[PDB]
Structure formats: structure tokens, C-alpha cells
Design goal:
Chains A, D: The active site is at residues 31, 53, 105. The structure is cut from a larger assembly and holds three copies of chain A and one copy of chain B (52 residues). Helices cover 3% and strands 43% of the residues of chain A. By secondary structure, chain A is mainly beta. With 52 residues, chain B is mainly α. The longest helix of chain B is centred in the first third of the chain and has 29 residues, at 2-30. Chain B has helices spanning 2-30, 39-44. Chain B starts with a helix and ends in an 8-residue tail after the last helix. Chain B is built from two helices and no strands. Classes of the chains: A mainly beta (153), B mainly alpha (52). Chains in contact: A-B, A-C, A-D, B-C. At the A-D interface, loops of A face loops of D.
């Protein structure tokens, strides 16, 4: 989809997740450990938030072009993922179970028009679909949606 | 010395609580792609000067 | 739309341009010079340091040669005298180089043909240089400057 | 399988040798200096032994499968090698002289079925065939067999 926008985080030689470069913000799931694989991006004053679990910083102006477009309007329906598709219904994001496993907790979620609507954080398995604990953008807020009994990716 | 020390601990603790409140209210708005930072909170708390 | 953009002259050479929109003559304030049209050059112009836009009221006769304006800025594709510009995520992007320092007044049109922006500068980056521009929201005029934009 | 089982060991960007993933222990020539390339096996404890020159450890349990089989039987004959093959005769491993040059001493030696018999350490040229200074496993003992005059690869 967009190769040059999702960057992996390394932890002693292990890809533990990814950090996305969206909407004039480099961002990563705070709770995933490691350091950004890019050296140029690594020396940035990241800023954590335990209650939101999203560590972010400003994208340096030298790489601003490789940034996705972002939306807050999230109509009910279907959206894209780097493992297949996701279905948005009732304030919850649902995926075919298992598709996507712990250790890739950072990858974004795109929209039909190709612009980022969410950042995956975790899983909650119940039935034929797993509900995706995700961090989203409201008009001005950033919101956590963790389904009951989720598990950290 | 004891009174002044207690006054200093009170001042520092209160100021730390204030700056913590600043954080707890402004960090939800620095991790969003769109730096709205409505001027109400922009004036009420010293705003980070978000850079469009 | 050739007779709506007037160039500003400095010692014999065009150093930017002054655009004619919405019953207002306007220009990038930071560029120095004099309006080429003498009739419009003898008007008083109110500058604004913090907005870099020096404007005045167009004389009643020549209102007709003034473009139409808009404030509603949907995501999409807009025009320019150098090819096209893209409006996305509250920024304006152009192909790098398309923008030369010194053409720092010219306007940005919309698909329907009505001015939506007034370029001032460029913030050079990758394949798409961002355009630091002074737009007009529904009642305010607002500067959008990405970091490091250099006055054209 | 056996083509992505031996992980090279780097030292400032020059291929200084290989560490093989044998049996249950990931061994390594205890001479060759450097740091292992896949970083994970470079963080495992590493029991060295000068007298044997074969520094090993216990394999991280994740990659258990990607490890070759072991044998003690070495009947007289013909054996495989990533630079061709070796021939086991008279208690010595013989290769075409010149085949293999200093700097790549780590590589294993397989058998026809394929079970890592031995790990080479160096060469010794006299005549058309160079003898290999090489470590084996007896039924219970790792053993060096190094012919005279061998110079380390």
C-alpha cells in the first residue's frame, strides 16, 4: 500500500512493532519496546503517555513528504489493513481472528480513500472476529478503544 | 530553617502539581495529528506553539 | 486571468506580484517594490507585520478585473500559475522547484476559478515543497507556515 | 534448510567466519573474532574453551528447528562442504588445495544423508590436497584433529 511510511522498531535485533509517520507526527505504540530502526529518526524527543499508550514526536522537516493523510471522520463500513481488511461497526473495529499476531502492534489502519484512521494497539479474541484495541483521532482528542479483556500486542 | 524548608516543599510540590496538570491536559492534544489546541486552553495554559 | 495579477517592480525587474481579489488589492508584504500600474501605485496600503500581507481597497472603476474568492477548502487539487497544487491535511504542496523565489505574490485558484490562497514562501522538502501561504478562513486571514519556509 | 543454517559472524564488515547451529548447541570457532550477525545469538551466554577452540552455548528455543543433525560415525569416504566437499581418509579431511582461503573457517561439514559431522578450523597444504584442521564429535567427546603446520583460516 505505502511501503515508505511504516517504520519498524528493533529490540536486540527483533522487530517488535512499527512506528507510523502520519499527520505531521511520528508515532508508535508506547508500550512496545525497542528503538526506531531508522537512525535519522531515532534522535528525536519522543513524548510518552501511559493513559493513551502512544509515544509520538514531530516528523523532522527533511522527510515530511513520506507522511500519510489522516482523517477523523470514520463512517461505519469497511477499511484496509496491512493484513487484509477491518470492519468498523458500533464503535468497534473487528478483524478475522488471528490475522495479525503479537509483535506487530504498531501498524496503522487505512481508509477506503487511503488515509489513516487508526493505529492498532492490541487484540481481544471473542469468536470468529478479534476486536482490535486501537487508538484513534477524534476531531481534537486522541481516544483509546480497548475492548473488554483485550491483550497487549 | 524548618519553616522555610516546609514553605519550599509546599511551593515546589504545588508548582509540580500545576505543571503536571499542564501535561495531563495538553498531552492529549500533542499526540493528535491536528494541533487544534483551542484558544481557551491555549490561553488558560501556556500553549506549546504547535507548528502547522 | 492575465489582467488580474499585477507585477511589482524593483529597479527595473519584477520582484513579486500584487493580486487583485475580492474588492481588495493585496500583496506579499515582505517583498519590496512598487506596483507597476501607476493608477494603483498611488493608493495607501495598510501593512501587517505578523501576517506579511499588505492590502488596500481597489479603485471603484477597476473592480471588474478582480477575481472571485472562496473560503471553503475541500481536500483536493487546485490550480497555480506553475502547474498544479494539492491541498491535503491543512497543507498546500507543489512539485519542488516549480516555485522559484521571487514569484511570491501569485495566487492559488480553485477548480471553479476563484482565489483560495496567496503564496508567500516555500518550505522545501522531498519531492513536494510545501507552500507557506496566507489563506482566508470564513472571517479571519490566517498564515500557514511550515517550518523553515523561506521568504520567496 | 542447510543453506540458511550457518549464520555468518561479522567484524567491521568483513566476512570473518561462520557460526553453525548444530544439534542443540550453537557452536562457533573460539578463535574468530567479531560479533555474530543475527543479534540474539550474540546475546546468549558463551562458554569458551581455548584447548578445543570451539566456543558454544545453548540455542535459544525459538529457532530449534533450524539446526542440523549430528553423527559420530565417520566411515571412510566422501563428505559435503559449502566449498565443494571433503574426503575422509587416514584420520584426515582432504580438500582440493586452494579450495577455501583464509577467513572462512567456521563452516560445517555434512555427510551424504546430511548430519553435521564436523566444523573446520583451518588448513594445512602439502601436495595437491590440503588437510583440514577440524573439530569432530566422538560418541561423547568433542575432539580436535589438527595436522601439523596448519595455519588458521
Amino acid at each position: 500500500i505505502e511501503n515508505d511510511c511504516i517504520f519498524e522498531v528493533k529490540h536486540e535485533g527483533k522487530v517488535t512493532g512499527y512506528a507510523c509517520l502520519v499527520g505531521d507526527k511520528v508515532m508508535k505504540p508506547a508500550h512496545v519496546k525497542g528503538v526506531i530502526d531508522n537512525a535519522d529518526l531515532a534522535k528525536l524527543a519522543f513524548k510518552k503517555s501511559s493513559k493513551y499508550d502512544l509515544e509520538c514526536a514531530q516528523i523532522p522537516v527533511h522527510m515530511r513528504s513520506d507522511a500519510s493523510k489522516y482523517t477523523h471522520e470514520k463512517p461505519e463500513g469497511h477499511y484496509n489493513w496491512h493484513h487484509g481488511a477491518v470492519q468498523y461497526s458500533g464503535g468497534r473495529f473487528t478483524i478475522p481472528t488471528g490475522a495479525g499476531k503479537p509483535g506487530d502492534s504498531g501498524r496503522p489502519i487505512f481508509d477506503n480513500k487511503g488515509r489513516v484512521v487508526a493505529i492498532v494497539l492490541g487484540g481481544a479474541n471473542e469468536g470468529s472476529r478479534t476486536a482490535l484495541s486501537v487508538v484513534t483521532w477524534n476531531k481534537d482528542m486522541v481516544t483509546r478503544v480497548t475492548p473488554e479483556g483485550s491483550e497487549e500486542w | 530553617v524548618g519553616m522555610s524548608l516546609l514553605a519550599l516543599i509546599s511551593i515546589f510540590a504545588s508548582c509540580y502539581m500545576l505543571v503536571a496538570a499542564r501535561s495531563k491536559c495538553l498531552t492529549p492534544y500533542a499526540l493528535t495529528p491536528g494541533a487544534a489546541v483551542p484558544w481557551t486552553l491555549g490561553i488558560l495554559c501556556c500553549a506549546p506553539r504547535a507548528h502547522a
